[PDB]
Each structure stands twice: as structure tokens, then as C-alpha cells.
Amino acid sequence: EAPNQALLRILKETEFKKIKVLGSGAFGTVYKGLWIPEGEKVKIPVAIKELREATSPKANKEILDEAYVMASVDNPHVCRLLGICLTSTVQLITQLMPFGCLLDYVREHKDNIGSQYLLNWCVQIAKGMNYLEDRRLVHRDLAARNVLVKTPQHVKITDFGRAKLLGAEEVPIKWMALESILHRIYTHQSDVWSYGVTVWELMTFGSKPYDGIPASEISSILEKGERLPQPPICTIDVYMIMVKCWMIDADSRPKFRELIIEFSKMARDPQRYLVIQGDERMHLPEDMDDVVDADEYLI
Numbered sequence: 348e349a350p351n352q353a354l355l356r357i358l359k360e361t362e363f364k365k366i367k368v369l370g371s372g373a374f375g376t377v378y379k380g381l382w383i384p385e386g387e388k389v390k391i392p393v394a395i396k397e398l399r400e401a402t403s404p405k406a407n408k409e410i411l412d413e414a415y416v417m418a419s420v421d422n423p424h425v426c427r428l429l430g431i432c433l434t435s436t437v438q439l440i441t442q443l444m445p446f447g448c449l450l451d452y453v454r455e456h457k458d459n460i461g462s463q464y465l466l467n468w469c470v471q472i473a474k475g476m477n478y479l480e481d482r483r484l485v486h487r488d489l490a491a492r493n494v495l496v497k498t499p500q501h502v503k504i505t506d507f508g509r510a511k512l513l514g515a516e517e518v519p520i521k522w523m524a525l526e527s528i529l530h531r532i533y534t535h536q537s538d539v540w541s542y543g544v545t546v547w548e549l550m551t552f553g554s555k556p557y558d559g560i561p562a563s564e565i566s567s568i569l570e571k572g573e574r575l576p577q578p579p580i581c582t583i584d585v586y587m588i589m590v591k592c593w594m595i596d597a598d599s600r601p602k603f604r605e606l607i608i609e610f611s612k613m614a615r616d617p618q619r620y621l622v623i624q625g626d627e628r629m630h631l632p633e634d635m636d637d638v639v640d641a642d643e644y645l646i
């Protein structure tokens with residue numbers, strides 16, 4: 348019933364300079380790059396995604412209707428759209444997240460990740476999801492891979508390719524609630540499950556969930572009542588929370604609002620809840636003169 352008032356911005360190819368490739372695909376390629384508004388006299392670090400010059404007519408809509416979604420969100424913990432460019436290929440411009448994949452990050456720095464950092468991440472992702480909740484929105488594919496590191500302190504949620512309005516009608520599996528796997532049913536509560544799994548990924552420094560098992564069986568497994576194991580670093584209090592997420596009755600599952608709160612609690616005495624060897628001996632980090640961050644651009 349509410350009207351989507353989101354502004355969608357068109358940019359000119361001359362306002363942005365592609366610098367280097369971050370990802371490549373049959374679908375297209377994504378560039379680390381910069382964008383300079385014509386008036387603005389500010390440089391903004393962007394990720395530019397450009398569909399391959401050959402364009403699939405079905406394919407093109409595919410990305411627009413993603414940009415439609417991104418455009419509709421404004422949040423600290425949600426990767427916002429900067430704009431799009433109607434070049435012969437259509438180019439999509441979002442905010443650059445320099446450290447990239449959270450999944451990768453924790454794999455690359457498993458030795459260096461503070462207990463506090465993880466708890467911080469957990470919250471932040473909960474703040475993210477509780478926002479998508481508020482905006483009546485269901486991510487439908489939450490995973491460690493789909494969270495992006497702007498800076499170690501800050502992460503933002505991403506890849507709402509599958510996002511749908513709650514109750515709307517129209518496969519990781521491992522991250523997907525049981526309700527979903529049998530019934531293709533999705534809810535915020537369904538997302539809470541995939542949140543649980545996400546936390547597990549982090550608390551195991553980026554380990555594969557259910558490693559070994561073909562995704563086929565999982566459905567049965569969960570009926571039996573089995574879930575993932577408690578990670579080594581995890582106190583029962585943290586694990587206990589993850590488990591709550593994995594209940595079959597989704598009304599028993601916690602609310603992203605609650606999770607924010609509970610991890611926020613634990614955020615304050617990190618070492619009370621995560622045991623990491625040498626916790627307090629760990630720390631994580633051409634002409635960038637006029638450069639500014641997107642989060643700092645709000646016309």
C-alpha cells in the first residue's frame with residue numbers, strides 16, 4: 348500500500364572511471380573504479396558492474412529489477428545502489444567494499460580476528476536484517492559470502508537477487524530453513540535460520556556447513572533433529588543462540604530485533620563469550636585526495 352518513493356539515478360559514463368577488474372563472468376564483469384559527479388568535485392569509490400556487450404533481453408531486465416531493489420534501501424548495513432548508466436550495455440554502480448567478501452576475509456585472517464570483531468559483525472548483520480524486515484523485505488539468501496566488508500569495523504549486507512516482499516509469490520539449501528527446503532517457503536524467520544548458519548560460518552572462521560553431505564539428505568537430517576556443531580571458540584551462550592535460530596517452529600526462533608540485542612549484550616564483554624587464543628593481541632587494519640565515501644554522499 349505504501350508507495351515506493353525511492354529515487355533512481357542515471358549516471359554518464361564520463362562521470363566514472365573503471366580502474367580494475369574485481370569479478371568476471373559470462374553474465375558480465377565488475378570493476379573497481381571511481382565516480383566523479385560533474386558539479387561535485389568529489390571522487391567516490393565504486394564497484395561498476397557491466398553486462399557483457401552481448402545483451403540477453405531477458406538478461407538485462409534481470410539486473411534492472413535487481414537495481415530496483417537496491418535503490419529502495421537506505422541503511423548503514425545494506426549495500427546501497429549509487430546509480431545506473433544506460434550505455435549500450437547497462438552499467439550498475441554501487442558502493443565499493445574494499446575488503447570484499449566477509450567469508451574470504453575471515454578465511455584470510457582467521458589468525459587475526461578478535462572476539463570483539465566477530466560479535467560486532469554479528470550485531471551489524473542483525474541490524475541489517477532487522478532493517479530488511481522493517482522494509483517488509485526477505486533476503487532469501489543470507490550467507491557469509493553475501494556480506495561485504497567496507498572496513499573490518501563495518502560490514503554491509505548484499506546480493507538480494509532473490510529478495511521478495513513478505514508473502515509475495517513467484518539453491519544454497521544448507522543455509523535454508525527447513526520450512527523452505529520442503530515447501531519453498533520463506534519468511535523473515537526463514538532468514539533468521541540462514542542467519543544462524545551465517546554466524547556459525549564466522550565462528551568457525553569460514554568453514555563449510557555440513558561438509559561432506561550431499562544437499563539432498565539435509566532435509567532428513569533436520570527432521571531427525573540434528574544441527575551443526577558448536578564451534579570450538581563458542582561458549583554455550585553463543586551457540587545456544589545459534590541453535591534457537593534452527594528450531595522448526597519458526598515462531599520459537601528469535602527476532603532480528605532480539606538478536607541485535609542479545610549479541611549487543613555480548614558485545615560488551617567479548618572475551619566472556621568467545622574464547623580465542625591470544626584474544627587481546629590481535630588487530631585488523633593514484634590521487635585519493637578529494638575522495639569521499641558514498642555513505643557520506645546524501646544529496
Ligand SMILES: *CCC(=O)Nc1ccc(CN(C(=O)Nc2c(Cl)c(OC)cc(OC)c2Cl)c2cc(Nc3ccc(N4CCN(C)CC4)cc3)ncn2)cc1
Nearest residue numbers: 370377394396439442443444445447448451492505506507
Ligand atoms: C567472496 C565472494 C565474493 O567475492 N563475492 C563478490 C565478489 C565481488 C563482487 C563485486 N561486487 C559486486 O558485485 N557488488 C554488487 C554489484 Cl556491482 C551489484 O550490481 C548488481 C549487485 C550486488 O548485490 C547483488 C553487489 Cl554486491 C562488489 C564488490 C565490492 N567489494 C569488493 C572488493 C574486492 C573484492 N575482491 C574479491 C576477492 N579478491 C580476493 C579480492 C578482491 C570483492 C568485492 N564492493 C561492491 N561490489 C561481488 C561479490
